[PDB]
Amino acid sequence: AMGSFNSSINNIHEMEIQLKDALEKNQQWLVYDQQREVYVKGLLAKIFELEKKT
Amino acid sequence: SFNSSINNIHEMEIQLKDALEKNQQWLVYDQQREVYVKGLLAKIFELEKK
């Protein structure tokens, strides 16, 4: 139908929105995880000093 | 041409299925890393009692 055609066009609008939002989120996971790695490397260096005291 | 535009929409769908598969991988990976960080702290705790 011509109504099913019109509806199917609107999803394709949502799809773009979904791509855009998911794209900027995997992109934010990078910054977040890069920061956690700073913390982890800190803890590891800290554990390594507590092991010299053993 | 329209057939050129429909091809892009097909590509857009491929990219979304990808951006969503990776977003899930980020989630599961995140939970594992958080469990890991707690382990490191738990080990720091045990080492400090000495």
Partner: peptide, 14 residues
């Protein structure tokens, strides 16, 4: 509008 992002951009944000 459903796909997940990180709790923050800084760590931890607790």
């Amino acid at each position: 509008d459903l796909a997940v992002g990180p709790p923050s951009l800084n760590y931890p944000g607790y």
